[PDB]
Amino acid sequence: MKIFLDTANIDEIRTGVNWGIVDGVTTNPDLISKEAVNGKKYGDIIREILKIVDGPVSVEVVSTKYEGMVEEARKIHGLGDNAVVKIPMTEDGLRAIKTLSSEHINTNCTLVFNPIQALLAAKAGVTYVSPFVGRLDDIGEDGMQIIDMIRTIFNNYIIKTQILVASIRNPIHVLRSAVIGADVVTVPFNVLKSLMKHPKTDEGLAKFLEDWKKVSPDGKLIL
Amino acid sequence: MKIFLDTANIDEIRTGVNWGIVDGVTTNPDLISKEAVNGKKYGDIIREILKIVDGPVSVEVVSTKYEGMVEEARKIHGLGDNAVVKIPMTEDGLRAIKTLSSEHINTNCTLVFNPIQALLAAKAGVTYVSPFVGRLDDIGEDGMQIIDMIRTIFNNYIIKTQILVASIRNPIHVLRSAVIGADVVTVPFNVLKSLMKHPKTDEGLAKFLEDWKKVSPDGKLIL
Amino acid sequence: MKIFLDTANIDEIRTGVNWGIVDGVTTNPDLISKEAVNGKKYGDIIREILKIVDGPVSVEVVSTKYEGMVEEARKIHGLGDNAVVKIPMTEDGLRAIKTLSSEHINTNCTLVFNPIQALLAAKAGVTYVSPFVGRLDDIGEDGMQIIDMIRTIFNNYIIKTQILVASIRNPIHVLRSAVIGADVVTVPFNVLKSLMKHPKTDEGLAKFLEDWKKVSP
Amino acid sequence: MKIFLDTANIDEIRTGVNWGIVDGVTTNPDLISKEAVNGKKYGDIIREILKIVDGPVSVEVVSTKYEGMVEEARKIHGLGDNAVVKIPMTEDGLRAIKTLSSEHINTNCTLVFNPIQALLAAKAGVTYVSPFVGRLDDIGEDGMQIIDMIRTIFNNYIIKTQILVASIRNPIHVLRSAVIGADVVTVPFNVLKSLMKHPKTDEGLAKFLEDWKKVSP
Amino acid sequence: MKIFLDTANIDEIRTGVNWGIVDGVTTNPDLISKEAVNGKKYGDIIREILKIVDGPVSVEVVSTKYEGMVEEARKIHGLGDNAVVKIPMTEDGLRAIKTLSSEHINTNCTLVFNPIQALLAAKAGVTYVSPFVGRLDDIGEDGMQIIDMIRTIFNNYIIKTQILVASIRNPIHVLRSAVIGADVVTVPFNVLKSLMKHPKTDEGLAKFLEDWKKVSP
Amino acid sequence: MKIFLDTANIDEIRTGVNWGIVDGVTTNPDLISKEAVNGKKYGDIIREILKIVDGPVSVEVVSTKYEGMVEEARKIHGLGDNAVVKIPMTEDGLRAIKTLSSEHINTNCTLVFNPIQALLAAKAGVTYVSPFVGRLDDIGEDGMQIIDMIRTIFNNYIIKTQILVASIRNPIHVLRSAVIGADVVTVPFNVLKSLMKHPKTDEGLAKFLEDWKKVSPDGKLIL
Amino acid sequence: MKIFLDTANIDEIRTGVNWGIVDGVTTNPDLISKEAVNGKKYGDIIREILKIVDGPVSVEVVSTKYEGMVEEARKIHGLGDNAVVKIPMTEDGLRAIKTLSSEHINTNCTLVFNPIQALLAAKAGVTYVSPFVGRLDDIGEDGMQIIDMIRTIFNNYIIKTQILVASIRNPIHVLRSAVIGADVVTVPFNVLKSLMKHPKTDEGLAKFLEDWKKVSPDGKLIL
Amino acid sequence: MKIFLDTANIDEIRTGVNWGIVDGVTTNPDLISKEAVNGKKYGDIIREILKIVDGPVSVEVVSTKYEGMVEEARKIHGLGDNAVVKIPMTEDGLRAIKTLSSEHINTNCTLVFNPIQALLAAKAGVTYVSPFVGRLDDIGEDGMQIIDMIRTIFNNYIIKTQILVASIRNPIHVLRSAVIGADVVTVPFNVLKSLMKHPKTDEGLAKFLEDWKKVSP
């Protein structure tokens, strides 16, 4: 399972990349606009993320009509070969995904909330499809059940579109995604950092170090 | 399923190896301090086990910082080709695993307590991951369910990291591990001895011997 | 299922209570210390919540010893009959719960993270037990499975302690609690506000509003 | 399971009551406005249905504020003892439901799309709750799963609110409601008539008729 | 589980009655028109079955219209108190069942092929409902599934209508009906006789016969 | 669950009754004819069993026609109120069961091999129905699945006939009967005696007695 | 679920009782010999536990013969009304249970290893039955599955004998027993202590205390 | 699935082999000492079975020490290429299996009673592992569940050791072994003879025999 960072915060991306467990980044207009304050411009933010992140960086078009989406997608593509164009699940979005797929421009269909939307995006040739599990949880349906159905549908037809679980809110979205077999999760920084932690890891590490000081006063391992 | 001995008692290790039922050994700072009493040095104990044991021997770093871990890891690797460097599940541990994996040094990520920690260790390139089922049992959650989820996750992504079940306390941890399909169990010596035994084996042996006396008084097979 | 509000924010409690969907309130030392700022005193906050909320109001002791816990629990009980004394799952806490239960002081055992702790709290006679599902989610275990096991255990032994699901983070903790059959959930205000809402409710209301205007401008 | 007709068409209602399988009627602003054409007024339509149907007749308020909903509800109730006041799942609607339930005015909470909304309506005291299965099917989720969850939740807490499955589109919504154990379904007239029919019933009747002409010309 | 005989053949009925394991009889116009040949009249056959069979005996109307069905049902009722009037699953049939139930005339709704038809018949007050499993088998659907669903639905609503499994073709229809918990099965005579038999019963008798000859010639 | 002894051997019955876990006895013409040798007559055997066993004793008619079965059943009944008349699943047997049931003579329908035979016997009013699990096993169908279906059928209709599992061959027929909820098992003596035994009981008892001799040399418990 | 302490250590028993979490005690000849060292008499140890403990106290006979068992049982009963006589699963044990049950002496049948032994002990009238789950684990079969079958069997026949799960080794034996619905668990002291504890309880307590210092420096609740 | 005959009775083996359904033979010291009576020597019995049976023939060592086991195993191997050396699951036995497997002497590990013993035997390289299902039945555990777990374990690790189900007591051990997918069953002669037979086979043959006589006396 690939793990992407769901943020436009440079310091978070830099930190998570330096950890070696971040395989790419997803952004959206809200995440970018949060960082586009105090003089910083959204063009600088996107270019700096593309520089820091070896893997896929998903950047969302703001146009809602087919022609503007394709024009924006080509400019996004030109920023670097690791850019992925994020396109909403709409009639014009599906037309744009089909056009861009023929041009070998990688795409990510967003604002997906049920399995048949995800299948339509795959049929248009999309590289990644992003169902939003947290926003389904918000309205009282367990969002992970949609990931499970999409995994089954995609397995049935040997679909090559990657499932990119998005709107992730807690580490059990991540656990269940991995047990289902989703291709990618994208997670806020607070979630990513919690994934490495467990109270019994901290307890056990401290205990081992104290056990060791009984045979090595300096605490070193000399061999 | 490979079976490792979880001990640094040299007498136990020799006895287990000579049954031919032991495929490797795991140690940790506690286990080694137990045997480093009354003049025996921890360096001597580690070197001896590496000599006696033909399979992998897992030896744990004691530094908590990345540089200290890679430095100690390279020294452990230099003691023998069967040495495996045991590295805790932490931010610096994951960084150390990725670097060492690139240097073709085998690694074992320890103090793992849930399936996503195990997945992160696999993503860093670790040779073995060791979830601690007995310490989960201690805090009232069935540790074998974590092994089951890790096996499913690893199957989903064709992950090559081996599942090394650790903190084993009884033969049912071993039985359930084999049914799940974990790659390795590491067991204390008293658990190892119990695995060969059953009261109906003992009874049946005794009976066949008495039956054979009716046809051969000396109890031999003359062919 | 009862729905409690997990906050000491008096403005949140007033709003939730005016909606009529809030059956009680839980607090803890963090929640209260979030409000007791810029002059406000914690004793005044607790008394104000006790006044606003008709239903149970949980207030946590701060002492860690049996004697201090019982003395604090008695002062809490005396602030109002709807007060419930929140007591951590410790050896001294179980002793305190047993004493307070014999004195007919209602109790709530908190910081519970597996089903056997919840059973011990019930054996001490506690009125409510609060397993923390979000903090279990945090450490990579589905916290709702612990609620499922506690419900089965309590059903097996006809236990009268109420399961009060706490550390709730989202509306699916609430849905799963109701399908399991937990007695109570306690929810932060953001979660409480989402429980009434659905986008098809909003859409359908707008549509019926336009439909009606055709026969009644 | 009770079976209500989901229409304001007086001819459909008369026909269906004349069959003996119609236990009540539901309406909404769309359904009434469809028949309030060619000089016919909505007040007369509602009154006519109330007279023809012995069972419950659900009539929706159009106000969106608490005070207007309660005032409308009391007028709807005055029209006849079998009137049930249909109220949307909103903050003001839950407030109106609690007030009306204390006045012993029967209520039906509408525009429900998940199980926790249904639980909130039952906590307010509503007589019926109407989850909309067809509109969930429309957005790609199997609406009958929501009914199954509500049935479990209501069984867990011995809830007396009746589950009134609404937005029914086909006979399998009806079959699945009965197997789940929903209290009521409300169905459009074309669904209702299809429920009595099966091709082997038709085939069997024709053969037995031909069989009987053998021994009785 | 009650066991009825599905025939109009007086000799089969007499034989199965002598066995003590036949609780009642069902007939239909095909079955009767098979026995009213070579001078035998259908009115004699019906009275003769009524006379032989202590338990319920179902006799089907031939009218298709409400008033004719009700008139015929009263004539069938007058023939003996154990007569049960078999009425098809149609609009007029449901109307007649309701009227006849109000007159305390027992009824059996026939030509039922899915669970919702069975539910409608129960709602009209019918004493027995007869789904036709063999004819469903004929068209490629496992007819016993329909029995399972009707059992679940009737349990859900504490329905007092008895499930009378009809169109039975083999002993596994009978086994499955009993495992589901259907109230009654009605069986053709060939099927009935087969239910008592098993080759290991035959073999064991013969061997005990030889065994006892070693001890008592 | 009641446990009956399936034998006509006086010494076995006496032994099992003295153990206090035998609630009655079933016989059949073969079992009796095995004991009716060396001068003993079958009438003496039956009367002696009826004397030893407080509970139900099932004795099989040898006639195959209705009138002879009822006449034999009345003579069997006259031997003692604890006698139960065993009658085969045949057309005449069912007629006899119905007649005897009206006369308040207890009955046991035997040679039952499927669930609908068992239901017909219950409808005739039989006190016990005896499906033969071992003889089904012999012909390649798992005989316990018939007990499970009979239990379900009888539960469905609140049938008061007791399920008396017969033709029992091993202790797992007995275990599965108890887990299903059959009313009675009838077991050969060899099976009954094995039911109390387990190798870990013997091992544990011996170990406890040796532990005790460390604090009480005589091996007694003085209080 | 009642919780008994499986020990004869008086200090453990006093400590456990004073937590109010201990409902009774079980002993056996081994456990008592452990505490009957350096002058302490086994009779004194038994009498003291009976004094300290308000709930049942199970004390095991050492005679293997029926007469010896009933004689010792009556003496054990005379020491206090809370005494329960522990009797092994044997032919003579079952006879002793039936006699003692008729004398209204409470009994506990021990060394049970499968569900039919447990059923036989219930048929003899035993107050408690003790299947040994840890010793089953030792010989490679999951002991908790035996508890599950016994609970089903007892439910089937409305058996009043209480299931007393014994040979408990870890907190998951306890968790699974409660989920199954066993009447009683008896646990060693180190397992008892572990049941109250969890690392997130410890962490959360520590955090609330630090949070409270921001509003109250002395860490008290002034009401 | 291979079917072996579990006996040293030469008459049983000849009969089973003449039927063509016997793929091999297992013996043990009890079975052989049952035959070596009234002058007959055990060495002659083993040699005669090796001659009659084309397939594998298992013969158990009697020594309990590694050195004696290997020396006995080598003499057994030299009696014929179809000989397989049966070795008990003990520490010395596992050592002997490992040595003999490296010498390409086929082995069978016996007295196995749980799935981890079977796994250890496979890790030592044993050709066949023989779990004892009837002796587990004797002590109140369903022995076939152990076969099910061993099959799953062996599938998990692509283990090439063959599962040889032993201590078989009835044809349902055989049926369940085949449904699980065990490689081999070894059966006593009484069981072997029952596997071909069914009363409906006997009945149908008699019936076709009579049917044919109508067209061919």
Ligand SMILES: *C(CO)[C@@H](O)[C@H](O)[C@H](O)COP(=O)(O)O
């Ligand atoms: C190394 C990881 O494979 C092992 O030595 C582990 O440290 C132990 O198995 C942990 O066991 P304990 O919980 O008994 O320390």
Ligand SMILES: *C(CO)[C@@H](O)[C@H](O)[C@H](O)COP(=O)(O)O
């Ligand atoms: C009291 C027990 O119901 C509550 O106030 C709990 O302390 C909180 O629900 C725990 O929540 P957090 O994990 O968010 O502190």
Ligand SMILES: *C(CO)[C@@H](O)[C@H](O)[C@H](O)COP(=O)(O)O
């Ligand atoms: C009356 C309803 O119970 C019965 O006589 C039915 O007509 C028959 O069981 C139907 O059987 P066929 O499909 O064989 O006509």
Ligand SMILES: *C(CO)[C@@H](O)[C@H](O)[C@H](O)COP(=O)(O)O
């Ligand atoms: C009495 C029966 O309830 C108990 O004392 C048992 O003897 C022990 O629980 C057995 O445990 P061990 O297997 O550890 O001896």
Ligand SMILES: *C(CO)[C@@H](O)[C@H](O)[C@H](O)COP(=O)(O)O
């Ligand atoms: C050898 C291993 O396959 C066999 O001869 C076994 O020893 C027997 O199958 C065991 O049977 P018993 O339990 O009847 O001795």
Ligand SMILES: *[C@@H](CO)[C@@H](O)[C@H](O)[C@H](O)COP(=O)(O)O
């Ligand atoms: C792009 C799709 O992969 C992501 O940035 C999504 O916009 C977010 O993950 C949505 O999360 P929120 O629901 O929290 O906005």
Ligand SMILES: *[C@@H](CO)[C@@H](O)[C@H](O)[C@H](O)COP(=O)(O)O
């Ligand atoms: C009232 C609630 O029982 C009903 O009239 C509902 O408004 C309808 O059943 C909704 O159906 P549509 O989705 O077709 O509007």
Ligand SMILES: *[C@@H](CO)[C@@H](O)[C@H](O)[C@H](O)COP(=O)(O)O
């Ligand atoms: C009477 C019915 O309870 C019993 O004696 C049965 O005849 C036997 O149990 C049948 O056993 P076999 O199949 O071994 O004869």
